Design a protein around this nucleic acid. Structure first.
Ligand SMILES: *C[C@@](*)(O)[C@H](CCCNC(N)=[NH2+])NC(=O)[C@@H]1CCCN1C(=O)[C@H](N)Cc1ccccc1
Ligand SMILES: *[C@@H]1O[C@H](CO)[C@@H](O)[C@H](O)[C@H]1NC(C)=O
Ligand SMILES: [K+]
Ligand code: NA
Lengths: 34, 259
DNA sequence: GGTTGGTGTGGTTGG
């Protein structure tokens, strides 16, 4: 069985959950345009 | 990780350290996908050519770590393995095709600010983001340089390292190496004419290659650090196990039992 | 001393 955690996966307690971006995360977003 | 930087605390809460009981040794990276499942590279557990064949009782998993070596008391969780499942078609002899393994924890781990699982990709997320030029993130406590020959600098970091790397077009991946590439792999890294560097290295195997979805802003694991030739060499690219392409085997074992 | 280092006795955390 999968176990607990799927519905909340990929949301970090110290970043997304606090609405805080980490230091280079925008660099990823920017590479995804076009 | 070569040419990356210290990771911020809580930055990769799905980062797992695969640890050898005796002698005590950091063996590889790995990732948390649930409260009881850990993903890693098969070669970290089984590699006949170097006489490597670990069993569940030889290993420990250290979840929630930042420092490579001090015991982060009341932060990290150390878990025993109930079972190790290596892909049944892992080609160790030829080219590490399907270099993936699942490890089931003895007891489920509680989540915290430092321990949270990453998402496995679905078809739309893979179709959308696994494109040349799109950047992913790789993390690890692995080597900072090629340590098998003389080189300046520390060979290992004191804290978890991160580095962002662009996925590379399959033809370039294919022409950059004489090892036979497979659809179960993908490569990433900057080209010589891009003037930015970075790569995973020895000791980073099993760590995750993650991407942040701009559709629901969740992090997804697209790849597993698998192999390379040297570390951060021009014209060379790090290779990663294609998680989505082996997704069917993953669901198959993870959803097998109801216990 | 402690399933581990030191600006320690909190901290990304008890005693
Ligand atoms: C096990 C891992 O830590 C490690 C990851 C290396 C990633 N390197 C780069 N630059 N991103 N993998 C290995 O060390 C694997 C195991 C076998 C040797 N190997 C390689 O990556 C050799 N360097 C190349 C290779 C040999 C045989 C078959 C496939 C690849
Ligand atoms: C790994 O070791 C186990 C026993 O420890 C053995 O049964 C298995 O066949 C080995 N795998 C190899 C060397 O292919
Ligand atoms: K202490
Ligand atoms: Na390179």
């Amino acid at each position: 069985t999968f176990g607990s955690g799927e519905a909340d996966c990929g949301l970090r307690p110290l970043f997304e959950k606090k609405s805080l971006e980490d230091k280079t995360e925008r660099e990823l977003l920017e590479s995804y345009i076009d | 990780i070569v040419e990356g930087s210290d990771a911020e605390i809580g930055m990769s809460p799905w980062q797992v350290m695969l640890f050898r009981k005796s002698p005590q040794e950091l063996l590889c990276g790995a990732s948390l996908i649930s409260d009881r499942w850990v993903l890693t590279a098969a070669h970290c557990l089984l590699y006949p050519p170097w006489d490597k064949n670990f069993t569940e009782n030889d290993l420990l998993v250290r979840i929630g770590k930042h420092s490579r070596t001090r015991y982060e008391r009341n932060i990290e969780k150390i878990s025993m393995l109930e079972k190790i499942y290596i892909h049944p078609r892992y080609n160790w002899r030829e080219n590490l095709d399907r270099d993936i393994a699942l490890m089931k924890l003895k007891k489920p781990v509680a989540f915290s600010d430092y321990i949270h699982p990453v998402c496995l990709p679905d078809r739309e997320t893979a179709a959308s983001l696994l494109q040349a030029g799109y950047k992913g993130r790789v993390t690890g406590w692995g080597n900072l340089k090629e340590t098998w020959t003389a080189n300046v600098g520390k060979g290992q970091p004191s804290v978890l390292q991160v580095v962002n790397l662009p996925i590379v077009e399959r033809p370039v991946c294919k022409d950059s190496t004489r090892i036979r590439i497979t659809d179960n792999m993908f490569c990433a890294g900057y080209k010589p004419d891009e003037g930015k560097r970075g790569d995973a290295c020895e000791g980073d195997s099993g760590g995750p290659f993650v991407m942040k979805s701009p559709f629901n802003n969740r992090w997804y694991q697209m790849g597993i650090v698998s192999w390379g030739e040297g570390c951060d060499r021009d014209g060379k690219y790090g290779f990663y196990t294609h998680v989505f392409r082996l997704k069917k085997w993953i669901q198959k074992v993870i959803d097998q039992f109801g216990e």
